[PDB]
Every structure is written in C-alpha cells, then in structure tokens.
Short mmCIF file of N, CA and C and ligand atoms in Angstrom, two decimals:
data_model
loop_
_atom_site.label_atom_id
_atom_site.label_comp_id
_atom_site.label_asym_id
_atom_site.label_seq_id
_atom_site.Cartn_x
_atom_site.Cartn_y
_atom_site.Cartn_z
N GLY A 1 14.25 -25.44 -22.62
CA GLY A 1 13.01 -25.72 -23.31
C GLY A 1 12.22 -26.41 -22.18
N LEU A 2 10.81 -26.82 -22.78
CA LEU A 2 10.07 -27.31 -21.77
C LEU A 2 9.99 -28.90 -21.95
N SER A 3 9.58 -29.57 -20.81
CA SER A 3 9.40 -30.92 -20.94
C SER A 3 8.12 -31.35 -21.45
N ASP A 4 8.00 -32.74 -21.83
CA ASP A 4 6.78 -33.36 -22.49
C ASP A 4 5.50 -32.89 -21.46
N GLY A 5 5.81 -33.20 -20.24
CA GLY A 5 4.85 -32.97 -19.09
C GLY A 5 4.39 -31.49 -19.22
N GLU A 6 5.52 -30.56 -19.20
CA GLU A 6 5.09 -29.02 -19.33
C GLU A 6 4.16 -28.74 -20.50
N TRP A 7 4.77 -29.09 -21.60
CA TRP A 7 3.93 -28.80 -22.83
C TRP A 7 2.56 -29.41 -22.69
N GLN A 8 2.36 -30.74 -22.19
CA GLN A 8 1.05 -31.26 -21.99
C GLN A 8 0.14 -30.19 -21.19
N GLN A 9 0.63 -29.63 -20.06
CA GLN A 9 0.07 -28.54 -19.07
C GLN A 9 -0.26 -27.34 -19.93
N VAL A 10 0.49 -26.96 -20.69
CA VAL A 10 0.43 -25.83 -21.45
C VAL A 10 -0.82 -25.74 -22.24
N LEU A 11 -1.08 -26.95 -22.99
CA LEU A 11 -2.04 -27.22 -24.05
C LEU A 11 -3.18 -27.69 -23.40
N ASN A 12 -3.21 -28.10 -22.12
CA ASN A 12 -4.35 -28.31 -21.27
C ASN A 12 -5.10 -27.15 -20.94
N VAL A 13 -4.06 -26.04 -20.34
CA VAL A 13 -4.60 -24.82 -19.85
C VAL A 13 -5.35 -24.19 -21.38
N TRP A 14 -4.62 -24.37 -22.55
CA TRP A 14 -4.97 -23.68 -23.65
C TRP A 14 -6.34 -23.91 -23.88
N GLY A 15 -6.84 -25.16 -23.46
CA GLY A 15 -8.21 -25.52 -23.83
C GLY A 15 -9.30 -24.61 -23.02
N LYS A 16 -8.90 -24.01 -22.02
CA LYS A 16 -9.72 -22.87 -21.42
C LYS A 16 -9.86 -21.63 -22.42
N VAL A 17 -8.94 -21.35 -22.86
CA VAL A 17 -8.72 -20.08 -23.92
C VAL A 17 -9.75 -20.50 -25.07
N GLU A 18 -9.50 -21.78 -25.56
CA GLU A 18 -10.14 -21.93 -26.69
C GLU A 18 -11.70 -22.08 -26.63
N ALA A 19 -12.08 -22.36 -25.49
CA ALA A 19 -13.63 -22.35 -25.22
C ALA A 19 -14.28 -21.20 -25.39
N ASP A 20 -13.52 -20.02 -25.31
CA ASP A 20 -13.93 -18.46 -25.44
C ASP A 20 -12.86 -17.72 -25.86
N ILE A 21 -12.19 -17.82 -26.92
CA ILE A 21 -11.22 -17.04 -27.45
C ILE A 21 -11.40 -15.50 -27.52
N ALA A 22 -12.70 -15.18 -27.97
CA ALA A 22 -12.96 -13.77 -28.10
C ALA A 22 -12.91 -12.89 -26.67
N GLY A 23 -13.49 -13.71 -25.75
CA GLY A 23 -13.74 -13.25 -24.42
C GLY A 23 -12.34 -13.14 -23.60
N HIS A 24 -11.24 -14.14 -23.95
CA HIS A 24 -10.05 -14.18 -23.27
C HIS A 24 -9.24 -13.08 -23.97
N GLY A 25 -9.38 -13.08 -25.18
CA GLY A 25 -8.65 -11.98 -26.09
C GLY A 25 -8.92 -10.60 -25.68
N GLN A 26 -10.26 -10.50 -25.45
CA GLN A 26 -10.83 -9.08 -25.31
C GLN A 26 -10.14 -8.67 -23.78
N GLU A 27 -10.37 -9.45 -22.75
CA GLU A 27 -9.98 -9.17 -21.48
C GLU A 27 -8.28 -9.25 -21.42
N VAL A 28 -7.35 -9.87 -22.24
CA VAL A 28 -6.01 -9.90 -22.29
C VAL A 28 -5.78 -8.31 -22.67
N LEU A 29 -6.27 -8.00 -23.87
CA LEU A 29 -5.90 -6.63 -24.51
C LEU A 29 -6.47 -5.48 -23.31
N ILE A 30 -7.57 -5.60 -22.75
CA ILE A 30 -7.93 -4.57 -21.83
C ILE A 30 -7.02 -4.58 -20.77
N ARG A 31 -6.69 -5.60 -20.09
CA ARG A 31 -5.68 -5.74 -18.92
C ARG A 31 -4.46 -5.07 -19.68
N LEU A 32 -3.98 -5.28 -20.85
CA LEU A 32 -2.63 -4.61 -21.09
C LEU A 32 -2.99 -3.00 -21.44
N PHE A 33 -4.01 -2.57 -22.05
CA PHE A 33 -4.29 -1.30 -22.37
C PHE A 33 -4.52 -0.32 -20.99
N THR A 34 -5.01 -0.96 -20.06
CA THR A 34 -5.56 -0.32 -18.79
C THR A 34 -4.48 -0.18 -17.86
N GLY A 35 -3.52 -1.33 -17.76
CA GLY A 35 -2.36 -1.47 -17.10
C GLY A 35 -1.21 -0.72 -17.55
N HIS A 36 -1.12 -0.56 -18.88
CA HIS A 36 -0.06 0.04 -19.49
C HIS A 36 -0.80 1.05 -20.76
N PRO A 37 -1.09 2.25 -20.44
CA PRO A 37 -1.76 3.03 -21.57
C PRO A 37 -0.69 3.47 -22.77
N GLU A 38 0.46 3.48 -22.40
CA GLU A 38 1.40 3.60 -23.65
C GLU A 38 1.02 2.60 -24.60
N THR A 39 0.71 1.52 -24.36
CA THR A 39 0.33 0.49 -25.28
C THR A 39 -0.70 0.78 -26.38
N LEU A 40 -1.69 1.28 -25.87
CA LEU A 40 -2.90 1.64 -26.54
C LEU A 40 -2.37 2.71 -27.80
N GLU A 41 -1.23 3.47 -27.55
CA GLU A 41 -0.88 4.37 -28.63
C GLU A 41 -0.27 3.71 -29.93
N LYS A 42 0.29 2.51 -29.60
CA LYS A 42 0.86 1.55 -30.81
C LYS A 42 -0.39 1.25 -31.73
N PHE A 43 -1.65 1.33 -31.41
CA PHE A 43 -2.69 0.94 -32.21
C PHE A 43 -3.53 2.06 -32.68
N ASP A 44 -3.42 2.64 -33.80
CA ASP A 44 -4.02 3.77 -34.24
C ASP A 44 -5.54 3.42 -34.20
N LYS A 45 -5.99 2.15 -34.55
CA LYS A 45 -7.41 1.64 -34.51
C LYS A 45 -8.04 1.62 -33.04
N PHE A 46 -7.21 1.67 -31.93
CA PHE A 46 -7.83 1.62 -30.60
C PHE A 46 -7.26 2.98 -29.82
N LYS A 47 -6.85 3.88 -30.41
CA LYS A 47 -6.62 5.08 -29.64
C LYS A 47 -7.73 5.86 -29.39
N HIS A 48 -8.91 5.83 -30.04
CA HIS A 48 -10.00 6.46 -29.81
C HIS A 48 -10.75 5.83 -28.49
N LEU A 49 -10.28 4.88 -27.96
CA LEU A 49 -10.97 4.22 -26.85
C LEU A 49 -10.48 4.82 -25.52
N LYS A 50 -11.20 5.72 -25.02
CA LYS A 50 -10.77 6.49 -23.84
C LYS A 50 -11.20 6.14 -22.53
N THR A 51 -12.12 4.97 -22.48
CA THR A 51 -12.45 4.47 -21.32
C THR A 51 -12.60 3.04 -21.23
N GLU A 52 -12.50 2.30 -20.16
CA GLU A 52 -12.76 0.82 -20.04
C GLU A 52 -13.86 0.26 -20.74
N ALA A 53 -14.96 1.11 -20.38
CA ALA A 53 -16.46 0.93 -21.09
C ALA A 53 -16.18 0.76 -22.44
N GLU A 54 -15.67 1.88 -23.04
CA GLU A 54 -15.52 1.99 -24.53
C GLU A 54 -14.75 0.70 -25.04
N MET A 55 -13.66 0.32 -24.33
CA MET A 55 -12.88 -0.84 -24.68
C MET A 55 -13.73 -2.08 -24.69
N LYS A 56 -14.46 -2.13 -23.67
CA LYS A 56 -15.60 -3.34 -23.40
C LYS A 56 -16.58 -3.60 -24.41
N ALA A 57 -16.97 -2.21 -25.13
CA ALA A 57 -18.09 -2.16 -26.03
C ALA A 57 -17.61 -2.29 -27.50
N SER A 58 -16.22 -2.32 -27.54
CA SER A 58 -15.71 -2.51 -28.86
C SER A 58 -15.42 -3.83 -29.47
N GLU A 59 -16.27 -3.88 -30.60
CA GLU A 59 -16.35 -5.30 -31.35
C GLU A 59 -15.12 -5.38 -32.11
N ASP A 60 -14.41 -4.29 -32.49
CA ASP A 60 -13.21 -4.56 -33.03
C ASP A 60 -12.11 -4.92 -32.18
N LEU A 61 -12.05 -4.58 -30.98
CA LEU A 61 -11.10 -4.97 -30.08
C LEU A 61 -11.28 -6.44 -29.78
N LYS A 62 -12.46 -6.97 -29.79
CA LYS A 62 -12.79 -8.35 -29.52
C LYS A 62 -12.15 -9.19 -30.59
N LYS A 63 -12.49 -8.59 -31.81
CA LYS A 63 -12.04 -9.13 -32.97
C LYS A 63 -10.40 -9.21 -33.27
N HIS A 64 -9.67 -8.23 -32.71
CA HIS A 64 -8.35 -8.34 -32.75
C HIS A 64 -7.83 -9.08 -31.45
N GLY A 65 -8.56 -9.27 -30.44
CA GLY A 65 -8.25 -10.38 -29.49
C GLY A 65 -8.24 -11.80 -30.17
N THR A 66 -9.24 -12.06 -30.75
CA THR A 66 -9.20 -13.38 -31.58
C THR A 66 -8.04 -13.60 -32.40
N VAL A 67 -7.73 -12.52 -33.11
CA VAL A 67 -6.60 -12.63 -34.11
C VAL A 67 -5.15 -13.15 -33.15
N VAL A 68 -4.89 -12.08 -32.14
CA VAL A 68 -3.88 -12.37 -31.38
C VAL A 68 -3.88 -13.81 -30.78
N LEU A 69 -4.84 -14.16 -30.00
CA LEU A 69 -4.97 -15.42 -29.35
C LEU A 69 -4.78 -16.68 -30.33
N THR A 70 -5.45 -16.51 -31.61
CA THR A 70 -5.24 -17.55 -32.35
C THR A 70 -3.84 -17.78 -32.96
N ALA A 71 -3.33 -16.75 -33.05
CA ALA A 71 -1.81 -16.80 -33.62
C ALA A 71 -1.04 -17.37 -32.49
N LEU A 72 -1.03 -17.11 -31.30
CA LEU A 72 -0.46 -17.51 -30.11
C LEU A 72 -0.73 -19.08 -29.89
N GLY A 73 -1.97 -19.41 -30.25
CA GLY A 73 -2.49 -20.65 -29.89
C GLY A 73 -1.59 -21.62 -30.87
N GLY A 74 -1.56 -21.05 -32.24
CA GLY A 74 -0.76 -22.00 -33.29
C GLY A 74 0.51 -22.09 -32.84
N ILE A 75 1.24 -20.99 -32.42
CA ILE A 75 2.52 -21.20 -31.74
C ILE A 75 2.73 -22.27 -30.62
N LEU A 76 2.04 -22.02 -29.66
CA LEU A 76 1.99 -22.80 -28.78
C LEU A 76 1.93 -24.57 -29.07
N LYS A 77 0.91 -24.71 -29.97
CA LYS A 77 0.90 -26.22 -30.45
C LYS A 77 1.97 -26.76 -31.22
N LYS A 78 3.06 -25.87 -31.56
CA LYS A 78 4.28 -26.28 -32.22
C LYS A 78 5.11 -26.74 -31.08
N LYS A 79 4.74 -26.46 -29.81
CA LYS A 79 5.84 -27.04 -28.71
C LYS A 79 7.29 -26.57 -28.63
N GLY A 80 7.45 -25.45 -29.13
CA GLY A 80 8.57 -24.78 -29.43
C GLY A 80 9.34 -24.95 -30.84
N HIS A 81 8.65 -25.68 -31.60
CA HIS A 81 9.20 -25.88 -33.10
C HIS A 81 8.46 -24.85 -33.86
N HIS A 82 8.68 -23.63 -33.39
CA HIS A 82 7.88 -22.54 -34.05
C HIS A 82 8.53 -21.50 -34.86
N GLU A 83 9.72 -21.73 -35.31
CA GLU A 83 10.40 -20.73 -36.18
C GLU A 83 9.61 -20.10 -37.22
N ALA A 84 8.94 -20.92 -38.12
CA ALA A 84 8.23 -20.26 -39.28
C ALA A 84 7.11 -19.41 -38.69
N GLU A 85 6.56 -19.92 -37.63
CA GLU A 85 5.48 -19.25 -37.22
C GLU A 85 5.76 -17.98 -36.49
N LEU A 86 6.79 -18.04 -35.72
CA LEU A 86 7.28 -16.81 -34.95
C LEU A 86 7.87 -15.76 -35.89
N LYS A 87 8.65 -16.05 -36.74
CA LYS A 87 9.48 -15.25 -37.71
C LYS A 87 8.89 -14.05 -38.09
N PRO A 88 7.72 -14.15 -38.86
CA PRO A 88 6.84 -13.07 -39.23
C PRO A 88 6.33 -12.18 -38.28
N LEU A 89 5.96 -12.71 -37.13
CA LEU A 89 5.39 -12.06 -36.08
C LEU A 89 6.53 -10.83 -35.51
N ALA A 90 7.65 -11.66 -35.26
CA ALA A 90 8.67 -10.64 -34.74
C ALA A 90 9.20 -9.75 -35.76
N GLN A 91 8.96 -10.01 -37.04
CA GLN A 91 9.43 -9.06 -38.07
C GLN A 91 8.46 -7.94 -38.18
N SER A 92 7.28 -8.30 -38.18
CA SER A 92 6.04 -7.27 -38.24
C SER A 92 5.89 -6.44 -37.05
N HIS A 93 5.98 -7.16 -35.76
CA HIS A 93 6.17 -6.29 -34.66
C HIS A 93 7.12 -5.38 -34.29
N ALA A 94 8.47 -5.79 -34.88
CA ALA A 94 9.53 -4.85 -34.70
C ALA A 94 9.76 -3.89 -35.64
N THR A 95 9.44 -4.26 -37.08
CA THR A 95 9.69 -3.24 -38.02
C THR A 95 8.46 -2.41 -38.42
N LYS A 96 7.20 -2.98 -38.34
CA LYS A 96 6.07 -2.23 -38.79
C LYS A 96 5.40 -1.64 -37.59
N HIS A 97 5.10 -2.44 -36.38
CA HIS A 97 4.36 -1.85 -35.47
C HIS A 97 5.24 -1.31 -34.52
N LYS A 98 6.49 -1.49 -34.39
CA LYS A 98 7.37 -0.89 -33.59
C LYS A 98 6.99 -1.22 -31.99
N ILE A 99 6.99 -2.33 -31.66
CA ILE A 99 6.55 -2.95 -30.35
C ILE A 99 7.67 -3.29 -29.60
N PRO A 100 8.14 -2.39 -28.58
CA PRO A 100 9.15 -2.94 -27.80
C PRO A 100 9.23 -4.28 -27.11
N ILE A 101 10.20 -4.98 -26.71
CA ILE A 101 10.06 -6.40 -26.36
C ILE A 101 9.11 -6.37 -24.79
N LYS A 102 9.46 -5.12 -24.27
CA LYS A 102 8.83 -4.89 -22.91
C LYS A 102 7.27 -4.99 -23.12
N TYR A 103 6.79 -4.51 -24.09
CA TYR A 103 5.34 -4.75 -24.22
C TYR A 103 4.83 -6.04 -24.29
N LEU A 104 5.70 -6.95 -24.92
CA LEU A 104 5.52 -8.40 -24.99
C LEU A 104 5.62 -9.12 -23.59
N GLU A 105 6.36 -8.57 -22.91
CA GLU A 105 6.55 -8.96 -21.24
C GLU A 105 5.04 -8.49 -20.85
N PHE A 106 4.57 -7.20 -20.94
CA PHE A 106 3.33 -6.93 -20.42
C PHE A 106 2.19 -8.07 -20.89
N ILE A 107 2.18 -8.14 -22.07
CA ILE A 107 1.09 -8.94 -22.62
C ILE A 107 1.11 -10.55 -21.98
N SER A 108 2.29 -10.87 -21.80
CA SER A 108 2.46 -12.19 -21.22
C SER A 108 1.94 -12.28 -19.91
N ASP A 109 2.40 -11.36 -19.08
CA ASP A 109 1.91 -11.17 -17.64
C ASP A 109 0.28 -10.94 -17.59
N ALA A 110 -0.24 -10.13 -18.59
CA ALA A 110 -1.63 -10.02 -18.75
C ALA A 110 -2.44 -11.39 -19.08
N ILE A 111 -1.83 -12.23 -19.96
CA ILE A 111 -2.40 -13.67 -20.14
C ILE A 111 -2.36 -14.28 -18.72
N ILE A 112 -1.25 -14.30 -17.97
CA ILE A 112 -1.26 -15.02 -16.64
C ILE A 112 -2.38 -14.48 -15.81
N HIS A 113 -2.53 -13.13 -15.51
CA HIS A 113 -3.58 -12.55 -14.96
C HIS A 113 -5.05 -13.00 -15.33
N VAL A 114 -5.31 -12.90 -16.67
CA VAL A 114 -6.57 -13.18 -17.29
C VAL A 114 -6.94 -14.71 -17.03
N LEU A 115 -5.92 -15.75 -17.22
CA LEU A 115 -6.32 -16.85 -16.66
C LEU A 115 -6.96 -17.10 -15.30
N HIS A 116 -6.18 -16.48 -14.30
CA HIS A 116 -6.44 -16.61 -12.83
C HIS A 116 -7.74 -15.99 -12.75
N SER A 117 -8.10 -14.85 -13.40
CA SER A 117 -9.26 -13.97 -13.02
C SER A 117 -10.53 -14.85 -13.61
N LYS A 118 -10.44 -15.46 -14.77
CA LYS A 118 -11.50 -16.11 -15.38
C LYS A 118 -11.51 -17.48 -14.92
N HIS A 119 -10.52 -18.14 -14.21
CA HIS A 119 -10.55 -19.36 -13.76
C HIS A 119 -10.01 -19.44 -12.42
N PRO A 120 -10.59 -18.69 -11.48
CA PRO A 120 -10.02 -18.62 -10.09
C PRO A 120 -10.12 -20.01 -9.57
N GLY A 121 -9.03 -20.53 -8.91
CA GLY A 121 -8.82 -21.78 -8.44
C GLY A 121 -8.65 -23.06 -9.33
N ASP A 122 -8.69 -22.84 -10.65
CA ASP A 122 -8.59 -23.69 -11.54
C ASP A 122 -7.50 -23.57 -12.48
N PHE A 123 -6.48 -22.80 -11.90
CA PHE A 123 -5.26 -22.63 -12.82
C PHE A 123 -4.06 -22.86 -11.93
N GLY A 124 -3.81 -23.97 -11.45
CA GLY A 124 -2.77 -24.53 -10.58
C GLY A 124 -1.54 -24.03 -10.60
N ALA A 125 -0.59 -24.41 -9.56
CA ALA A 125 0.68 -23.89 -9.55
C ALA A 125 1.52 -24.75 -10.55
N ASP A 126 1.22 -25.70 -10.98
CA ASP A 126 1.95 -26.31 -12.04
C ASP A 126 1.83 -25.87 -13.50
N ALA A 127 0.33 -25.74 -13.64
CA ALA A 127 -0.13 -25.22 -14.80
C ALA A 127 0.56 -23.70 -15.06
N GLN A 128 0.55 -22.75 -13.92
CA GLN A 128 1.10 -21.49 -14.15
C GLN A 128 2.48 -21.61 -14.50
N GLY A 129 3.34 -22.61 -13.67
CA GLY A 129 4.74 -22.66 -14.10
C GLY A 129 4.82 -23.06 -15.61
N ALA A 130 4.08 -23.90 -16.02
CA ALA A 130 4.44 -24.45 -17.43
C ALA A 130 4.01 -23.43 -18.38
N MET A 131 2.86 -22.66 -18.17
CA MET A 131 2.47 -21.66 -19.04
C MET A 131 3.46 -20.54 -19.22
N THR A 132 4.02 -20.05 -17.74
CA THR A 132 5.03 -19.04 -17.92
C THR A 132 6.25 -19.48 -18.54
N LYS A 133 6.68 -20.79 -18.40
CA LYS A 133 7.74 -21.24 -19.43
C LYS A 133 7.45 -20.93 -20.77
N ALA A 134 6.35 -21.38 -21.18
CA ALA A 134 5.93 -21.22 -22.50
C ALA A 134 6.06 -19.78 -23.27
N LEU A 135 5.29 -18.97 -22.45
CA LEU A 135 5.50 -17.35 -22.79
C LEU A 135 6.71 -17.08 -22.90
N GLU A 136 7.68 -17.45 -21.83
CA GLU A 136 9.13 -16.93 -21.93
C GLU A 136 9.69 -17.40 -23.10
N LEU A 137 9.45 -18.68 -23.45
CA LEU A 137 10.13 -19.31 -24.72
C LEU A 137 9.81 -18.30 -25.84
N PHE A 138 8.44 -18.09 -26.08
CA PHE A 138 7.93 -17.18 -26.96
C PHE A 138 8.55 -15.76 -27.08
N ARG A 139 8.77 -15.22 -25.83
CA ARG A 139 9.27 -13.92 -25.75
C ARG A 139 10.90 -13.91 -25.92
N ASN A 140 11.46 -15.16 -25.56
CA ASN A 140 12.89 -15.27 -25.76
C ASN A 140 13.18 -15.42 -27.19
N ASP A 141 12.57 -16.31 -28.04
CA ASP A 141 12.84 -16.51 -29.30
C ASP A 141 12.38 -15.12 -30.24
N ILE A 142 11.30 -14.55 -29.98
CA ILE A 142 10.98 -13.17 -30.56
C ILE A 142 12.21 -12.24 -30.26
N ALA A 143 12.83 -12.14 -28.99
CA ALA A 143 13.78 -11.34 -28.58
C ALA A 143 15.14 -11.57 -29.52
N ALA A 144 15.31 -12.59 -29.99
CA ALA A 144 16.47 -13.09 -30.60
C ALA A 144 16.40 -12.35 -32.01
N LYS A 145 15.03 -12.58 -32.54
CA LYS A 145 14.87 -11.78 -33.97
C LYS A 145 14.81 -10.55 -33.80
N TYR A 146 14.36 -9.84 -32.65
CA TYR A 146 14.64 -8.34 -32.53
C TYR A 146 16.09 -7.89 -32.48
N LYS A 147 16.91 -8.73 -31.88
CA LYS A 147 18.39 -8.30 -31.85
C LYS A 147 18.83 -8.39 -33.19
N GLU A 148 18.51 -9.47 -34.12
CA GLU A 148 19.00 -9.71 -35.37
C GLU A 148 18.61 -8.43 -36.14
N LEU A 149 17.44 -7.77 -35.88
CA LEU A 149 16.94 -6.55 -36.63
C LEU A 149 17.37 -5.22 -36.06
N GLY A 150 18.19 -5.29 -34.77
CA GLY A 150 18.77 -4.18 -34.02
C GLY A 150 17.52 -3.38 -33.47
N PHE A 151 16.50 -3.97 -33.42
CA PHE A 151 15.17 -3.27 -32.92
C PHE A 151 15.19 -3.08 -31.45
N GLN A 152 14.87 -1.77 -31.00
CA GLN A 152 14.94 -1.58 -29.59
C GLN A 152 13.46 -0.92 -29.34
C1 HEM B 1 1.17 -12.77 -27.83
C2 HEM B 1 1.81 -11.72 -28.33
C3 HEM B 1 1.18 -11.21 -29.73
C4 HEM B 1 0.68 -11.88 -30.64
C5 HEM B 1 0.60 -13.38 -30.83
C6 HEM B 1 0.43 -10.72 -31.63
C7 HEM B 1 -0.28 -11.12 -32.86
C8 HEM B 1 -0.61 -10.22 -33.95
C9 HEM B 1 -1.03 -10.68 -35.14
C10 HEM B 1 -1.28 -11.86 -35.54
C11 HEM B 1 -1.26 -9.52 -35.84
C12 HEM B 1 -1.89 -9.31 -37.25
C13 HEM B 1 -0.69 -9.59 -38.23
C14 HEM B 1 0.74 -8.84 -38.11
O1 HEM B 1 0.53 -7.60 -38.15
O2 HEM B 1 1.63 -9.45 -37.96
C15 HEM B 1 -0.83 -8.29 -34.97
C16 HEM B 1 -1.06 -7.12 -35.31
C17 HEM B 1 -0.63 -5.97 -34.60
N1 HEM B 1 -0.17 -6.03 -33.23
FE1 HEM B 1 0.25 -7.71 -32.29
N2 HEM B 1 0.61 -9.51 -31.12
C18 HEM B 1 1.23 -9.71 -30.10
C19 HEM B 1 1.80 -8.76 -29.10
C20 HEM B 1 1.53 -7.40 -29.28
C21 HEM B 1 1.63 -6.15 -28.51
C22 HEM B 1 2.15 -6.51 -27.09
C23 HEM B 1 1.21 -5.08 -29.14
C24 HEM B 1 1.53 -3.62 -28.50
C25 HEM B 1 1.57 -3.39 -27.34
C26 HEM B 1 1.08 -5.43 -30.37
C27 HEM B 1 0.62 -4.52 -31.33
C28 HEM B 1 0.36 -4.82 -32.64
C29 HEM B 1 -0.33 -3.74 -33.61
C30 HEM B 1 -0.17 -2.19 -33.44
C31 HEM B 1 -0.92 -4.29 -34.91
C32 HEM B 1 -1.41 -3.80 -36.26
C33 HEM B 1 -2.84 -3.79 -35.66
C34 HEM B 1 -3.82 -3.10 -36.77
O3 HEM B 1 -3.71 -1.94 -37.05
O4 HEM B 1 -4.62 -3.98 -37.43
N3 HEM B 1 1.12 -6.84 -30.45
N4 HEM B 1 -0.55 -8.97 -33.90
O1 NO2 B 2 10.31 -27.42 -25.82
N1 NO2 B 2 10.87 -26.37 -25.71
O2 NO2 B 2 11.38 -25.80 -26.69
O1 NO2 B 3 7.95 -34.69 -19.17
N1 NO2 B 3 7.67 -35.00 -18.14
O2 NO2 B 3 8.12 -34.33 -17.28
O1 NO2 B 4 -2.66 -7.21 -29.55
N1 NO2 B 4 -1.60 -7.62 -30.17
O2 NO2 B 4 -1.52 -7.50 -31.41
O1 NO2 B 5 -1.61 -1.97 -44.61
N1 NO2 B 5 -0.61 -2.57 -44.09
O2 NO2 B 5 -1.09 -2.78 -42.75
#
C-alpha cells in the first residue's frame, strides 16, 4: 500500500485537478483517445469525434471527463479503503463497457502526462511516485475484480 506521507502527496496533487476538473478530465480523455484510437471505439457517444478539434469542441466529452475524474477523486480520498467505491466501477467496465485492463493502464499513464503538461515543473519526483502508486493500487484492485469475473 501507500504510506501516510505518500497519500498526503497524492491528495495534494489532486488539489490541482480539483481546481479545473473539467479541463483536466477533457485533456485526460483527449490524450487517451489520440494516443490509443481503439479506446474511442468503446464509446458509442464519442465515435463521431473524427479529429482532435472535434474532441476539444465537444461539451459532452468535457462532461464525461468531469464524471470520470470525480469518481477517481472519491476513490483516492479513501486512501485504499475503496472496496465499495471500486466494486461497481470494476463491474460496469468489465461487464457492460467491456474495457480491457490495458485501457486502464493507458488512462493512468494519460493522467501522469496531463499533470506534467498542465503543471510543468510543479509535479515533483516525489509527487509522481506517490500518484503512480495510487493509480497502480486502483488498477490492481480493479484487476482483481476483473479476474473474479473472468474478464479479459
Ligand atoms: C480512472 C479510470 C476510470 C474511471 C474512474 C471511470 C469512470 C466512469 C464512470 C463513473 C462512468 C459512469 C458510470 C458507469 O458506467 O460505471 C463511466 C462510464 C463509462 N466508461 Fe469509464 N472510467 C475509467 C476508465 C475508462 C476507460 C479507460 C474506458 C475506455 C477506454 C472507459 C469507458 C467507459 C464507457 C464506454 C462508459 C459508458 C459511457 C456512456 O455511454 O455514457 N472508462 N466511467
Ligand atoms: O494504503 N494503501 O492501501
Ligand atoms: O508516512 N510517511 O512516510
Ligand atoms: O472515461 N472513462 O470512462
Ligand atoms: O442504459 N444503460 O446505460
């Protein structure tokens, strides 16, 4: 797990996201979709987005970005005690949305990139370490639920 000190760093970094949740959420999804176009295909409601300009101009994409990072934020503030919060998301993403765990790796990497891009020089080595650990814990606990469900 993470140390108390590491959790404190995670939640300090998260303060950056909370100041502009829509903007961070939008950039995370754009980074995901542009780096990994196969991920766009999992969203019927974003499939029409044929260019990054269209992605940037999509108010619904920003809306979903807010939904996604709000959910993640709630999970992070549980500091690993997130079974109840994580369970339903693991279940919907495996069973309904059919999201391979690899795509959760992609979006985790996208979050790290967006933090550096929006806050260059203000996302320190210790902070990256802590946030990376938190995202790995999140992914690992989702993966356990995926295995329960036999989802690949
Ligand atoms: C930080 C990781 C993620 C979080 C916190 C997250 C969160 C959410 C939430 C809260 C919802 C709405 C409720 C639900 O259906 O469970 C949702 C819907 C959805 N998610 Fe995710 N998600 C994540 C990663 C991903 C990834 C990587 C993909 C695909 C590559 C994905 C695909 C979808 C799809 C297709 C929906 C349904 C969208 C709609 O039609 O309205 N999710 N997600
Ligand atoms: O504190 N990590 O679960
Ligand atoms: O929990 N202090 O590393
Ligand atoms: O954007 N992930 O639902
Ligand atoms: O209507 N089920 O998303």
